């Protein structure tokens, strides 16, 4: 092992001097003589056998001339079935207070993406049990998914519902990466995973633990952590999933909360690393740093990784560089809106901004494609009539336009549904709606069969039959 000396300290940026045998970039360095473990990741070579590194933990307590040891390799995270049922940090250390990870292997979080020759697979359809998603923005089994939205629109709830409706039924493994989210959310997720069998902790009389089963692995880089950790925790989780993809060959599920935080972390240090800022304060190495991540998330001829990324959109501005760049990296897209959530329509998915590569007549049949496109046409027509209604009124609209407005309102209210995890907000029970039922109901509503039925009936109903039951109840209570 080499030996170096800390030269200066500026926030989360640390310059280090070596007498000989400089380490390559991305290598990991360990500070010696500190309270807790402190790892640094090489980022730049400056000259005079000097390097510039990014600290994973706080630099408080560091001293110039303090000693540093090169490990000869980048941050190696443990992998295997031993990480399952267990929480891990950015540097692989556990933070679950259950013991160390007895892994027989370690992978470097920094790897090269699979080449073009390693093609994808067929666009397999993924059934989530959600209506608007399965109808208008079908999710692919082997492709990337995006959940765009600001603050207070239902990203975390939707990911939790997807976990309840997919991860439990999934025969492969699954991974979660908390990238700059709230820690309370992590505690809640861990408890819910221990509850629903996705994690199986069994304490022993000798003080050890047993996580047998427990088809899930958790990684956390939350807001309390500094930059350097929030950035690399995503690569950590992605390597943990790449192990199961390449070697085991099992299908894997990756959930990321939020990816935007990862980009923000880079900006927090770029100006300290001597870079000139980009347009709105972001770093120059935005698109590349994000693509080097995203290209590692892809299906190959050995396995498949289905990812679900929640993308914070600050100030509800989709023109921001981070989501603007992320849009191009996704197979399926789902944009959540505040104007819809104000109407109590949860999930607050905007069906006119959500898209999907899979929505084509050759993949999903024409009964699905034409139904979705008719729904979208109806909603756009209702959106174009908004100003005429606001100025003149409903009196001016013809009966065709009134029928259009009625059907569009019914569709809007019908795409809503209650989740199982939102019981603690609404109190109502959860529903799992299969896709043929959704298509039947949408065809029925668009054909004009349900014009007689009241608009209120189509609220938080899994199926059209439930809507009929609610209408019957409301009519009976009317007299």
């Amino acid at each position: 092992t080499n030996h170096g000396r800390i030269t200066q300290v500026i926030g989360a940026v640390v310059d280090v001097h070596f007498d000989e045998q400089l380490p390559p970039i991305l290598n990991s360095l360990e500070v010696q003589g500190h309270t807790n473990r402190l790892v640094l990741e090489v980022a730049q070579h400056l000259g005079e056998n000097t390097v510039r590194t990014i600290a994973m933990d706080a630099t408080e307590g560091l001293v110039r001339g303090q000693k540093v040891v090169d490990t000869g390799a980048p941050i190696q995270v443990p992998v295997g079935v031993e990480t399952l049922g267990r929480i891990m940090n950015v540097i692989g250390e556990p933070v679950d207070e259950c013991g160390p990870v007895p892994a027989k292997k370690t992978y470097s979080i920094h790897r090269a993406a699979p080449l073009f020759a390693d093609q994808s697979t067929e666009p397999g359809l993924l059934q989530t049990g959600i209506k608007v998603v399965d109808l208008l923005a079908p999710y692919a089994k082997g492709g990337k998914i995006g959940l765009f939205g600001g603050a207070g629109v239902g990203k975390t709830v939707l990911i939790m519902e997807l976990i309840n409706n997919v991860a439990n039924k999934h025969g492969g493994f699954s991974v979660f990466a908390g990238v700059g989210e709230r820690t309370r959310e992590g505690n809640d997720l861990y408890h819910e995973m221990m509850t629903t069998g996705v994690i199986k902790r069994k304490k022993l009389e000798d003080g050890k633990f047993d996580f047998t089963g427990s088809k899930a692995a958790l990684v956390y880089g939350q807001m309390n952590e500094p930059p350097g950790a929030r950035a690399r925790v995503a690569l950590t989780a992605l390597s943990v999933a790449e192990y199961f993809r390449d070697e085991q060959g099992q299908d894997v599920l990756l959930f990321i909360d939020n990816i935007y935080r990862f980009t923000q972390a880079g900006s927090e240090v770029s100006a300290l690393l001597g870079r000139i800022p980009s347009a709105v304060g972001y770093q120059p190495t935005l698109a590349t740093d994000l693509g080097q991540l995203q290209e590692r998330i892809t299906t190959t001829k050995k396995g498949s990784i289905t990812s679900v990324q929640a993308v914070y959109v600050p100030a509800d501005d989709l023109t921001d560089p981070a989501p603007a760049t992320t849009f191009a990296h996704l197979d399926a897209t789902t944009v959540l809106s505040r104007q819809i959530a104000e109407l109590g329509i949860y999930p607050a998915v905007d069906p006119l901004d959500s898209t999907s590569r899979m929505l084509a007549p050759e993949i999903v049949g024409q009964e699905h494609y034409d139904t979705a496109r008719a729904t979208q046409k109806l909603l756009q027509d209702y959106k174009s009539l908004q100003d005429i209604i606001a100025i003149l009124g409903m009196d001016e609209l013809s009966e065709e336009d009134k029928l259009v407005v009625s059907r569009a309102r019914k569709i809007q209210r019908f795409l809503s549904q209650p989740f199982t995890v939102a019981e603690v907000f609404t109190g109502k029970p959860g529903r799992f709606v299969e896709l043929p039922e959704t298509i039947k109901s949408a065809q029925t509503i668009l054909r004009g069969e349900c014009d007689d039925l009241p608009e209120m009936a189509f609220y938080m109903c899994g199926g059209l039959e439930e809507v009929r039951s609610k209408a019957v109840k409301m009519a009976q209570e009317a007299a």
């Binding site: 100006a271 001597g274 000139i276 800022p277 980009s278 347009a279 709105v280 304060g281």
Partner: protein, 51 residues
């Protein structure tokens, strides 16, 4: 008949007033656009010269 005549007159006046408001808002929009460009560029330059 009187109602319909008054309706046409009111629509005329409303369209005219809307055009005036559009002119004013266009001026304000261009001002704010120039301000945004200048502010972003000054931020970039000040971050470039503090190296």
């Amino acid at each position: 008949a009187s109602e319909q005549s008054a309706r046409m007159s009111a629509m005329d006046n409303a369209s005219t007033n809307a055009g005036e408001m559009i002119s004013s808002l266009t001026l304000r929009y261009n001002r704010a656009r120039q301000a945004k460009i200048t502010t972003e560029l000054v931020e970039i330059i000040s971050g470039a010269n503090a190296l």
